[PDB]
Design a protein around this ligand. Structure first.
Ligand code: NA
Ligand code: NA
Ligand code: NA
Length: 366
């Protein structure tokens, strides 16, 4: 089903991205990526469409296109408004040059399933246009995502998704306990970071099949988080093994344990060009001179010129704050001590839908 396809996409995207970005922090929102591309698929046809939907993990013989979008619609309905169940907002926008008219079916589809705003722009005045998109995203993400467009090949259509997430720990870290500690980035790199601590009953697992130890923490509401510490030098072994089956196997093994849990106060961000990642995943027609975007508009034959994702993560003693945005441009064609003081993995899930909300590879917490 949908949860599984979205999780499979999330792990593949993460895996491909980690490989191409060996030193830098990885922080992404796979649910945001899925939603943007799923909405985009509505404007595609032929091989382009087939390739995009299969790349996203949907088998078009096991499920019709309508059932995919109804599924995303439910997810957006669930994630659109913030509340205590999940303090998260998520939304889509289509920025369109004034010279272009959407096809009626596409227009209704994006509004219906994705509650997409459609906003007319003058992309010949690219400075103004990109600034307007920038402040749209800045405002939607409570100021967390700035300068989405940095300065910059113009486009005549820009699809935008954003996500803002707040999580309060069910088990907060001890305020008095926080101290500066070494964080071992790599063999030649040590940084100082505030290191949080709690001594608590926490769901813990020392994995017997993979070289890692992990905990699962809850947020107030439906959010839940896995913190996975590979044995030193074993990051790639653990990353390679991530899957639905691994999550389920970790869930079956996690036991209430007394843990002295050390996790740094993380403040990180990244910007990722997702085009080559997507091509590696088999999503390629999108970008070629034969891209089939014939359901978007008959005013031009379009192709995607660029897909970019920017995301930010903050961890503190009280909880988590995370935000993400994607754009796609188109143009004419004993207490157990567990110490997170070196590269680790973060997986944030909605426990209700089992959507992968955010995924981290924290190389440097500062
Ligand atoms: Na909601
Ligand atoms: Na405690
Ligand atoms: Na909870």
């Amino acid at each position: 089903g949908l949860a599984s396809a979205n999780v499979d996409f999330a792990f593949s995207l993460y895996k491909h991205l980690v490989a191409l970005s060996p030193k830098k922090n990885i922080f992404i929102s796979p649910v945001s990526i899925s939603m943007a591309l799923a909405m985009l698929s509505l404007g595609t046809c032929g091989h382009t469409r087939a390739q995009l939907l299969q790349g996203l993990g949907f088998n078009l013989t096991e499920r019709s296109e309508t059932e995919i979008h109804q599924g995303f619609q439910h997810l957006h309905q669930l994630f659109a408004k913030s509340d205590t169940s999940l303090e998260m907002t998520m939304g889509n926008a289509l920025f369109l040059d004034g010279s272009l008219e959407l096809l009626e079916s596409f227009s209704a589809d994006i509004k219906h399933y994705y509650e997409s705003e459609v906003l007319a722009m003058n992309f010949q005045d690219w400075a103004t246009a990109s600034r307007q998109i920038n402040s749209y995203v800045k405002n939607k993400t409570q100021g967390k995502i700035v300068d989405l467009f940095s300065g910059d090949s113009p486009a005549i259509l820009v699809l935008v998704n954003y996500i803002f997430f707040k999580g309060t720990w069910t088990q907060p870290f001890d305020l008095a306990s926080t101290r500066e500690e070494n964080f071992y980035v790599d063999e030649t790199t040590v940084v100082k970071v505030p290191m949080m601590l709690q001594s608590s009953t926490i769901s813990y697992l020392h994995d017997s099949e993979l070289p890692c130890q992990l905990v699962q923490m809850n947020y107030v509401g439906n959010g839940t988080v896995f913190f996975i510490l590979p044995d030193k030098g074993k990051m790639n072994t653990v990353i390679a093994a991530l899957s639905r089956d691994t999550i389920n196997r970790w869930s079956a093994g996690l036991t209430s344990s007394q843990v002295d849990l050390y996790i740094p106060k993380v403040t990180i961000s990244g910007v990722y060009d997702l085009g080559d990642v997507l091509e590696e995943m088999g999503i390629a027609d999108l970008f070629t001179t034969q891209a089939n975007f014939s359901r978007i508009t008959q005013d031009a034959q379009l192709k995607s010129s660029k897909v970019v994702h920017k995301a930010v993560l903050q961890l503190n003693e009280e909880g988590t704050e995370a935000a993400g945005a994607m754009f796609l441009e188109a143009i004419p064609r004993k207490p157990i001590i567990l110490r997170f003081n070196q590269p680790f993995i973060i997986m944030i899930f909605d426990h209700f839908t089992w959507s992968s909300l955010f995924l981290a590879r924290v190389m440097n917490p500062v």
